Coordinates of C-alpha atoms (C1' of nucleotides) in Angstrom, one line a residue:
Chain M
X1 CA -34.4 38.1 14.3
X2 CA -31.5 39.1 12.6
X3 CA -29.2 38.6 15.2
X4 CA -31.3 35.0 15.8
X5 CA -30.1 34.0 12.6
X6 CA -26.4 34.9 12.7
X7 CA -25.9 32.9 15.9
X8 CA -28.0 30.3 14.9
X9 CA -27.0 30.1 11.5
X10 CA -25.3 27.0 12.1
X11 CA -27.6 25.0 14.5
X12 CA -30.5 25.3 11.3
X13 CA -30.5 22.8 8.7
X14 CA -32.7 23.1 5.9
X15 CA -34.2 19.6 4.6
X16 CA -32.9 18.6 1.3
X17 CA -33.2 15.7 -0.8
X18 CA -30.9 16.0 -3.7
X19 CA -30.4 13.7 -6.9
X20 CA -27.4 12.6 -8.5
X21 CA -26.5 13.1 -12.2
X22 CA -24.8 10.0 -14.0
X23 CA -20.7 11.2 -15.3
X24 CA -21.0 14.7 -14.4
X25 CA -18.1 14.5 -11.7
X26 CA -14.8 16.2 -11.3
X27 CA -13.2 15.5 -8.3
X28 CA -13.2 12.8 -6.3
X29 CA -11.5 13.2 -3.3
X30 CA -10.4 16.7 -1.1
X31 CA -12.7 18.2 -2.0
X32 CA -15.6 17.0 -3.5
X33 CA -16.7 18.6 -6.7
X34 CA -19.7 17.1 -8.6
X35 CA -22.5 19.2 -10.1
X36 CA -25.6 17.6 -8.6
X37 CA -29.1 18.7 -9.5
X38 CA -32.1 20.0 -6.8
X39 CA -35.0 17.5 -6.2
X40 CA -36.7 18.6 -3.0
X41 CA -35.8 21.1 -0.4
X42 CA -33.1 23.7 -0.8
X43 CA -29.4 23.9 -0.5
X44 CA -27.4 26.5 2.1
X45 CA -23.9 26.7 2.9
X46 CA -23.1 24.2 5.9
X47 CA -25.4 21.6 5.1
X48 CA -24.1 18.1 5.9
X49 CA -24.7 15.0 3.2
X50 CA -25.3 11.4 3.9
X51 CA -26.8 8.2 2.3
X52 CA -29.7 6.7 3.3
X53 CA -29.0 3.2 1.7
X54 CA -25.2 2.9 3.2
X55 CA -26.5 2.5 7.4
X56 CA -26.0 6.7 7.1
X57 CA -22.6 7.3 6.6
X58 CA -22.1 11.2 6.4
X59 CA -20.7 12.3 3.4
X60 CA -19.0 15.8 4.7
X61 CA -19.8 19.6 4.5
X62 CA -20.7 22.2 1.9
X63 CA -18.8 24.8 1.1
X64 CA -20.1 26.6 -2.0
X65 CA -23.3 26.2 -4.8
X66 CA -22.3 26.9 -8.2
X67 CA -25.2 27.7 -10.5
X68 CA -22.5 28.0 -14.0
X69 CA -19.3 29.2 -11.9
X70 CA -21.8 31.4 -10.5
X71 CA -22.0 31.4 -6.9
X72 CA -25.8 31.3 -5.7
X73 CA -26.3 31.0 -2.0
X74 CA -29.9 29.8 -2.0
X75 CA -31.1 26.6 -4.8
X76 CA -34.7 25.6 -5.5
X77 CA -35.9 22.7 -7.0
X78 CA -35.5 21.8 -10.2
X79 CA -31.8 23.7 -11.1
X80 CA -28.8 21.6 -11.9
X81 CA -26.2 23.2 -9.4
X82 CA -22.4 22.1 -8.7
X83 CA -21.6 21.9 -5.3
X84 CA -18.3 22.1 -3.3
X85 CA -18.3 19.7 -0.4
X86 CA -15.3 19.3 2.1
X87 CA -14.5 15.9 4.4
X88 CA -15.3 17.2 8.2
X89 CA -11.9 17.3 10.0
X90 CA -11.5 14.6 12.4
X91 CA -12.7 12.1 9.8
X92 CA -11.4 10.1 6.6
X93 CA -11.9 11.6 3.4
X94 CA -13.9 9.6 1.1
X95 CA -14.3 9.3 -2.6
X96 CA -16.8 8.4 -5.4
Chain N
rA1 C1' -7.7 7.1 -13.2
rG2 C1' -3.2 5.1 -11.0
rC3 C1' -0.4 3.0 -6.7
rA4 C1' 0.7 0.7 -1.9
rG5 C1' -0.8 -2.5 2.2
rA6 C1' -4.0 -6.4 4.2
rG7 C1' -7.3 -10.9 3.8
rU8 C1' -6.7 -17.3 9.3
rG9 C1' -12.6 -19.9 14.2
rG10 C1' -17.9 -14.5 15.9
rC11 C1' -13.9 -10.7 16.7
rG12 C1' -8.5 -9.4 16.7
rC13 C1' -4.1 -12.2 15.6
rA14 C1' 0.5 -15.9 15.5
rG15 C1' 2.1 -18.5 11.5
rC16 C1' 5.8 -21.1 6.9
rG17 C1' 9.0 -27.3 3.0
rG18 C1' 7.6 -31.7 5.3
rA19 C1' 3.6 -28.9 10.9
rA20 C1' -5.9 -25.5 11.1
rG21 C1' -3.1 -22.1 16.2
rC22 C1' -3.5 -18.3 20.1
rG23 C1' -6.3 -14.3 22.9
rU24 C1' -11.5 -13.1 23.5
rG25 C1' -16.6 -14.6 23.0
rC26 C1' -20.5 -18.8 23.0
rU27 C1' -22.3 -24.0 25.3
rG28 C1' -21.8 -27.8 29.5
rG29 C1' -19.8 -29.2 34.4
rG30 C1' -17.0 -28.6 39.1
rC31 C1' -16.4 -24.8 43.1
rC32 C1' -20.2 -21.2 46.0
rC33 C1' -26.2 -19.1 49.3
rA34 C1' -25.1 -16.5 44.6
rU35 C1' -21.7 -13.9 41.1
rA36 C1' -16.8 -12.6 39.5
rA37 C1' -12.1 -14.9 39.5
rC38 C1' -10.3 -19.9 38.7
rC39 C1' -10.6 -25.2 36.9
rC40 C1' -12.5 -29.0 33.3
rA41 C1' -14.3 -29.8 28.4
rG42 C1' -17.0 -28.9 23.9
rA43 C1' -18.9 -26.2 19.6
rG44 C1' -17.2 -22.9 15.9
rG45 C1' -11.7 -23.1 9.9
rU46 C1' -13.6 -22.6 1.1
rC47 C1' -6.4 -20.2 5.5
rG48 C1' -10.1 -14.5 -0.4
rA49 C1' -10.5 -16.9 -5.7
rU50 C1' -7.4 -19.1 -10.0
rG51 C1' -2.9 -21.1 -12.3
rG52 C1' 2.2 -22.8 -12.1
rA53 C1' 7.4 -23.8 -10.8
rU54 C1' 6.8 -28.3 -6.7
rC55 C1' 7.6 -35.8 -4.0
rG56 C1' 5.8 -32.2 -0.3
rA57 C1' 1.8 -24.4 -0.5
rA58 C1' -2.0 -22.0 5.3
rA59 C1' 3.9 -20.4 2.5
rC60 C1' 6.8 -18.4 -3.4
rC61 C1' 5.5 -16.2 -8.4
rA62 C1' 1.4 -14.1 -11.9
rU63 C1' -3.8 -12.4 -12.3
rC64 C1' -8.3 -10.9 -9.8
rC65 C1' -11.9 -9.6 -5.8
rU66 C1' -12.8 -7.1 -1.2
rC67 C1' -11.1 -3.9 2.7
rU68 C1' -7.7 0.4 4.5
rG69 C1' -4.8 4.5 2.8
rC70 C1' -3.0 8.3 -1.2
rU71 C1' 0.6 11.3 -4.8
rA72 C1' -3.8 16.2 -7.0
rC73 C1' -6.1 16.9 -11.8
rC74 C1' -11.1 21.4 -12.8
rA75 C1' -16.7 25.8 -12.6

RNA sequence: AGCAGAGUGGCGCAGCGGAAGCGUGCUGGGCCCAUAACCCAGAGGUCGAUGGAUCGAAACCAUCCUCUGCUACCA
């Protein structure tokens, strides 16, 4: 099992819903760094984000959670976390 | 945050002092057993909004909106 998770560490997406805090936002654009706090589901490294109001435009991938520049590989619900995201290659970058 | 570019028929696009168009798509007819191709028509336009220099702005200048890119500036 082990092993079943290091090759299929990728294919697995944990759920997530995740709500937005008003003015907490650093960057804008490349990357994407805005400290965004845990509603439902947990957050892993690799997890794409999208909108559900915007026809489902994908927002890009994760690269780190930051729990007070303290890097925490798993979030639950309920913890205000800052997350890196990066724009997939291939695609435009987008901003807030 | 700031800048640059663009806005024309459903879509893309030509287009500027005396001047609402093209390609495609939609509708009708001819042709054919039938379709494509082709022919004949027709429908579909706040030329992004505002002001002004103008006899004569779809056009030039100023502002603004929307859309598309960026110089990087964080835990």
């Amino acid at each position: 099992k082990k092993q079943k998770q290091e090759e299929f560490k990728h294919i697995a997406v944990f759920p997530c819903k995740m709500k937005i805090l008003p003015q907490y936002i650093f960057n804008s654009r490349d990357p994407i760094v805005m400290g965004v706090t845990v509603e439902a589901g947990q957050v892993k490294q690799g997890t794409p984000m999208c909108v559900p109001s915007k026809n489902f435009v994908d927002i890009g991938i994760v690269t780190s959670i930051e729990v007070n520049h303290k890097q925490v590989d798993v979030a639950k619900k309920g913890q205000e976390v800052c997350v890196k995201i990066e724009p997939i290659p291939g695609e435009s970058p987008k901003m807030f």
